[PDB]
Design an enzyme around this catalytic site. Structure first.
Site, mmCIF file in Angstrom:
data_model
loop_
_atom_site.group_PDB
_atom_site.id
_atom_site.type_symbol
_atom_site.label_atom_id
_atom_site.label_comp_id
_atom_site.label_asym_id
_atom_site.label_seq_id
_atom_site.Cartn_x
_atom_site.Cartn_y
_atom_site.Cartn_z
ATOM 1 N N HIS A 55 0.788 -1.256 0.000
ATOM 2 C CA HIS A 55 0.000 0.000 0.000
ATOM 3 C C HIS A 55 0.834 1.328 0.000
ATOM 4 O O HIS A 55 0.230 2.402 -0.074
ATOM 5 C CB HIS A 55 -1.015 0.008 1.160
ATOM 6 C CG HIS A 55 -2.374 0.531 0.801
ATOM 7 N ND1 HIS A 55 -3.457 0.352 1.644
ATOM 8 C CD2 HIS A 55 -2.782 1.222 -0.291
ATOM 9 C CE1 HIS A 55 -4.483 0.921 1.035
ATOM 10 N NE2 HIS A 55 -4.125 1.458 -0.130
ATOM 11 N N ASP A 102 -9.570 -0.110 4.418
ATOM 12 C CA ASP A 102 -8.410 -0.678 5.098
ATOM 13 C C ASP A 102 -8.708 -0.903 6.572
ATOM 14 O O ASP A 102 -9.516 -0.179 7.162
ATOM 15 C CB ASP A 102 -7.232 0.330 4.975
ATOM 16 C CG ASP A 102 -5.824 -0.219 5.120
ATOM 17 O OD1 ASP A 102 -5.612 -1.093 5.981
ATOM 18 O OD2 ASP A 102 -4.928 0.266 4.406
ATOM 19 N N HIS A 144 -6.324 -0.394 8.632
ATOM 20 C CA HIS A 144 -5.383 0.584 9.183
ATOM 21 C C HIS A 144 -5.513 1.965 8.516
ATOM 22 O O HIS A 144 -5.900 2.058 7.351
ATOM 23 C CB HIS A 144 -3.943 0.058 9.047
ATOM 24 C CG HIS A 144 -3.799 -1.401 9.375
ATOM 25 N ND1 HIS A 144 -3.812 -2.369 8.385
ATOM 26 C CD2 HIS A 144 -3.700 -2.008 10.575
ATOM 27 C CE1 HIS A 144 -3.689 -3.524 9.012
ATOM 28 N NE2 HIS A 144 -3.611 -3.359 10.331
ATOM 29 N N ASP A 188 -2.907 4.074 7.907
ATOM 30 C CA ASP A 188 -1.707 4.309 7.045
ATOM 31 C C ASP A 188 -1.314 5.820 7.002
ATOM 32 O O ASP A 188 -0.759 6.302 6.001
ATOM 33 C CB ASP A 188 -1.936 3.748 5.608
ATOM 34 C CG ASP A 188 -2.193 2.255 5.539
ATOM 35 O OD1 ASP A 188 -2.254 1.614 6.605
ATOM 36 O OD2 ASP A 188 -2.338 1.731 4.415
ATOM 37 N N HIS A 227 4.778 1.380 4.036
ATOM 38 C CA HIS A 227 3.468 0.888 3.607
ATOM 39 C C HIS A 227 2.318 1.339 4.572
ATOM 40 O O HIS A 227 1.149 1.356 4.179
ATOM 41 C CB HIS A 227 3.504 -0.645 3.377
ATOM 42 C CG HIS A 227 3.331 -1.483 4.615
ATOM 43 N ND1 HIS A 227 2.517 -2.600 4.615
ATOM 44 C CD2 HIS A 227 3.887 -1.350 5.839
ATOM 45 C CE1 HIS A 227 2.603 -3.105 5.833
ATOM 46 N NE2 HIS A 227 3.412 -2.385 6.605
ATOM 47 N N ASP A 269 -7.251 -2.004 0.311
ATOM 48 C CA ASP A 269 -6.311 -2.892 0.968
ATOM 49 C C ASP A 269 -7.114 -4.136 1.332
ATOM 50 O O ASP A 269 -8.159 -4.022 1.992
ATOM 51 C CB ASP A 269 -5.732 -2.227 2.236
ATOM 52 C CG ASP A 269 -4.619 -3.006 2.937
ATOM 53 O OD1 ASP A 269 -4.617 -4.253 2.848
ATOM 54 O OD2 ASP A 269 -3.775 -2.369 3.596
ATOM 55 N N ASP A 319 -6.599 -6.363 3.491
ATOM 56 C CA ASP A 319 -6.671 -6.606 4.939
ATOM 57 C C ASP A 319 -7.864 -5.875 5.604
ATOM 58 O O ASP A 319 -8.122 -6.083 6.785
ATOM 59 C CB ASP A 319 -5.324 -6.302 5.656
ATOM 60 C CG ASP A 319 -4.948 -4.824 5.820
ATOM 61 O OD1 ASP A 319 -5.865 -3.986 5.977
ATOM 62 O OD2 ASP A 319 -3.743 -4.518 5.814
ATOM 63 N N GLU A 336 -1.806 -5.225 -1.014
ATOM 64 C CA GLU A 336 -1.471 -6.159 0.082
ATOM 65 C C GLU A 336 -1.823 -7.646 -0.201
ATOM 66 O O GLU A 336 -1.925 -8.439 0.744
ATOM 67 C CB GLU A 336 -2.057 -5.695 1.437
ATOM 68 C CG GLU A 336 -1.395 -4.439 2.006
ATOM 69 C CD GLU A 336 0.101 -4.530 2.268
ATOM 70 O OE1 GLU A 336 0.563 -5.576 2.778
ATOM 71 O OE2 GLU A 336 0.807 -3.544 1.971
HETATM 72 O O1 LIG Z 1 2.608 1.851 10.679
HETATM 73 C C1 LIG Z 1 2.721 0.643 10.683
HETATM 74 O O2 LIG Z 1 3.747 0.003 10.200
HETATM 75 C C2 LIG Z 1 1.668 -0.337 11.300
HETATM 76 N N1 LIG Z 1 0.594 0.440 12.009
HETATM 77 C C3 LIG Z 1 -0.708 -0.316 11.870
HETATM 78 C C4 LIG Z 1 -0.358 -1.591 11.105
HETATM 79 C C5 LIG Z 1 0.918 -1.249 10.325
HETATM 80 C C6 LIG Z 1 0.675 -0.634 8.933
HETATM 81 C C7 LIG Z 1 0.007 -1.560 7.910
HETATM 82 C C8 LIG Z 1 -0.122 -0.969 6.502
HETATM 83 B B1 LIG Z 1 -1.372 -1.561 5.765
HETATM 84 O O3 LIG Z 1 -2.626 -1.044 6.259
HETATM 85 O O4 LIG Z 1 -1.414 -1.223 4.373
HETATM 86 O O5 LIG Z 1 -1.455 -3.040 5.832
HETATM 87 MN MN LIG Z 2 -3.065 -0.217 3.825
HETATM 88 MN MN LIG Z 3 -3.965 -2.538 6.118
#
Ligand SMILES: O=C(O)[C@H]1NCC[C@H]1CCC[B-](O)(O)O
Ligand SMILES: [Mn+2]
Ligand SMILES: [Mn+2]
Ligand SMILES: O=C(O)[C@H]1NCC[C@H]1CCC[B-](O)(O)O
Ligand SMILES: O=C(O)[C@H]1NCC[C@H]1CCC[B-](O)(O)O
Ligand SMILES: [Mn+2]
Ligand SMILES: [Mn+2]
Ligand SMILES: [Mn+2]
Ligand SMILES: [Mn+2]
Lengths: 319, 318, 317
Positions: free
Chosen positions: B99, B122, B124, B126, B139, B230, B232, B275
């Protein structure tokens, strides 16, 4: 520290309320998952009161068909004194079960300090069977019958339940997630006119409207203490399989978190019970950890943990 | 139809996060017959192929921020390709990849349509800045680089000098949030960004969530829609083959409903399918389950409706 | 009570589709103790038995449409049996068997009650004509033979000369659609049939879906209801042992809600429990899961409520 985040942990290793051994290890596995540590990470004022020592009664004779009357009555009597002690300090009583028969003492002890409390009962069952209407004899499906003021005269004098004084009325209790109600239990539920939200009501209105109606029914007139008696079998066995009485078509992981998130948002949560976590009834070790992780997530959402996020009262961009 | 005119962009990039295999996302999405299934639902499909992300070996971390030059150049290359697809009057379909590529996917789309609205599906936010982040994975940092209100809070990261914040806080809507860091939650609440976390999805239902989402972005005026999806965001029971899976997510039905409502506006101009990691599955069935769900999400974005689809011909008289 | 007076009809038929095993559907439903569970629920249960479907030799296919004489005769025999159950003042409960038997079940029910309304719970419309079909499987063609507006569009198929169009486009409501053919979607939109596809279920919620379904069919005045329930209408995670499973279906809770709401009206007059195939369960657990769900759906049609059920006596004294 905020009142809604000031907690008082109470360990209840009791199992004689039902015929399946293993539910007494419930407060042990919940502590092993790091429940007290995860709560402290959420800015919560956590004070442990330890596990209550429940003595063995080998000369316990059954009343008619009711199983272990003296053992259950003494366990709730010992819990009532401990729950009242936590409430006197000005802390939210968190009872880790153990079977649902412990709710007699947890609600009685909480009512000794706050008699104007409202009960939110999250369970697949009503637990309103009287010692005369019960067909199993298990006291974990009989707590509400002993606690209701309207049933004063219909409950026979069972040994060990002399200390029990009806504290809650039919208008002060709300059920959420009913899907396995006995004929005797459904009659009492409809005759007393108790407010309930069975799976039929949850599907009809949605978990949003169910929580909007539940809180408006108990807090609409005036702000009063809230006692949440959470049975893990209230949630679907796909999220909580390690339990005594699993019933299909239950509340989802999201629905359970939403119930608990709205209860914290009111800032009136005063009593909490995490009941029926049985680590021995799990088919696989993954099914055991899943029930514990869900029960932990339910507990953390009761004291602040929100899915939108959580942050301390400081500037994160400029510290 | 312009709502069915698509330009396929393969983005095999994984240096935005530490888990290898997400770069094989466009390969396994193509192998499921995505381009063939899109041509079946009367779509004008043009394949621009997979982007040649040249190796950047000398890529030291900025404080704790992993692979800054590789992420920055990959998004800069994607930005030029997305703008080229938008100039040819086609919907930019970015097959991920992690992402972090959303920086370039949204920036490039903004070069042709600066008035666009973002829908971020998502688990999250991000929105971590290169300073608030704890893992250093870019990401989980794309939204911070794109927001105009965060100008002055993003430091000089190597490979990101080309980045210019294009979207305002009011031009973005989140759906499916359930794992937000403390630093991220502070930014989300202070900027006043419209969000629909799993709590809001449980409260209103996916019907009112989509009704409010479209009324919030298309209320003032009708403008292009960029959907950054995303996988997830959906529950790990439907999309398990992903880097950061979180329990209690959006259902297969909710995911289809979001994508079906976005197509019906006839304003979808940009789409990201990110993702998808075919090496982070417990069983090969879990990998196929994620890809099939990702293909179903994409087909619903370009016309596929659960009620049915039919050509403008008399089926009772062929 | 009239809402709890049932007439059990077994329909061991499979020639409406190519997957063998759906003829064992009434056998495993009976083995789960469906009739016994209904009697414990204070239901007046009469078992009309399992219908004998004699194998017709040299049943040549009409163009691409498979086994026309077998499907036509099976529905003809079911039409006479459903009408016989309706004349005795009982609710017809047809245990399937493939969904092509709905031609006979709805036709036979319409011979006694012509003012009936159909609630079709299915992942598919089953509205394909013998000319628009691409598979030639009659289990995805029952609604086309029943509709009055499609008279003249259906060719003279052998074994179907007895069929008289009994239901109008305004008298049928679909619930749970997610796999509709182009030809089927053309018929669904041009006839103006009321439908609640998975898209509408996600949009409004099962509560609003049932409120609108019953207000649309009963709005004018009280009328008989025919519930044709295809188990594939529910998600394959609840009913995996089925011929045409489609992901993202109705939940076990939603299925119980639809059926609990139809019982509460007291107007359930006809019922079909179709497409239960015990040979299509990957594990014996998947077989029991589908049958347990199909039994729960049937029990909710005749009184079983999740809030609880009790006799009209004092349980305290
Ligand atoms: O900042 C970060 O590295 C983490 N904080 C929440 C999970 C993780 C980020 C995940 C990115 B995505 O939503 O795209 O899976
Ligand atoms: Mn994401
Ligand atoms: Mn995510
Ligand atoms: O009264 C009993 O023993 C039983 N009647 C309803 C189901 C069962 C009780 C369920 C267990 B518990 O009370 O904890 O919900
Ligand atoms: O006409 C057909 O053969 C096919 N068109 C949609 C799916 C399939 C029919 C499925 C019949 B039933 O819903 O009963 O499972
Ligand atoms: Mn209980
Ligand atoms: Mn229970
Ligand atoms: Mn069908
Ligand atoms: Mn079907």
């Amino acid at each position: 520290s905020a009142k809604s985040r000031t907690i008082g942990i109470i360990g209840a290793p009791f199992s004689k309320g039902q015929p399946r051994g293993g539910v007494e290890e419930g407060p042990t596995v919940l502590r092993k998952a790091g429940l007290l540590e995860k709560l402290k990470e959420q800015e919560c004022d956590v004070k442990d009161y330890g596990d209550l020592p429940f003595a063995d009664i080998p000369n316990d004779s059954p009343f008619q068909i009711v199983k272990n009357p003296r053992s259950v009555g003494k366990a709730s009597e010992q819990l009532a004194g401990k729950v009242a002690e936590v409430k006197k300090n000005g802390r939210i009583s968190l009872v880790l079960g153990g079977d649902h028969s412990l709710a007699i003492g947890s609600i009685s002890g909480h009512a000794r300090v706050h008699p104007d409390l409202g009960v939110i009962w999250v369970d697949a069952h009503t637990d309103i069977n009287t010692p005369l209407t019960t067909t199993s004899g298990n006291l974990h499906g009989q707590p509400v019958s002993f606690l209701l003021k309207e049933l004063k005269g219909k409950i026979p004098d069972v040994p060990g339940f002399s200390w029990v004084t009806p504290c809650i009325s039919a208008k002060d209790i709300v059920y959420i997630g009913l899907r396995d109600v006995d004929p005797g239990e459904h009659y009492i539920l409809k005759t007393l006119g108790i407010k309930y939200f069975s799976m039929t009501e949850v599907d009809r209105l949605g978990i949003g409207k169910v929580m909007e109606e539940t809180l408006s029914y108990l807090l609409g007139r005036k702000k009063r203490p809230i006692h949440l008696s959470f049975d893990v079998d209230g949630l679907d066995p796909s999220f909580t399989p390690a339990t005594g009485t699993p019933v299909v078509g239950g509340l989802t992981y999201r629905e359970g978190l939403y119930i608990t998130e709205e209860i914290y948002k009111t800032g009136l949560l005063s009593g909490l019970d995490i009941m029926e976590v049985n680590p021995s009834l799990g088919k696989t070790p993954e099914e055991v950890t899943r029930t514990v992780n869900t029960a932990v997530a339910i507990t953390l959402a009761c004291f602040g943990l929100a899915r939108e996020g959580n942050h301390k009262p400081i500037d994160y961009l400029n510290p």
